[PDB]
Amino acid sequence: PLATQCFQLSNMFNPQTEEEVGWDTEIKDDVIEECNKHGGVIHIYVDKYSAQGNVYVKCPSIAAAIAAVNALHGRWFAGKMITAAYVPLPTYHNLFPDSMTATQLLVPSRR
């Protein structure tokens, strides 16, 4: 598959077994913190409804996304193996139009 600025993480959680309030905000912060070791994030969306446990990410550049996908794919997260896969830029922008103009690097919500 061809590398792009965007990718999807899968198997990050099971929404049916997530009971704690603001659990998706904690997942978001886990992804931002981990991608700061690479090139950062400009857009993130935690899918609270798919059983697959999907997280959508947009990096500031294709190089930043390659660094993040290579480092995150096949990792353990909360005792489960996660998959990282590229998302074509028109597919990502159709899902998240507000990500088209995103430029600012995201900061985690928690300390």
Binding site: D30, E34, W76, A78, G79
Partner: peptide, 9 residues
């Protein structure tokens, strides 16, 4: 909080 690189129990 530790979830990254945590293998199954």
């Amino acid at each position: 909080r530790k979830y990254w690189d945590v293998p199954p129990p």
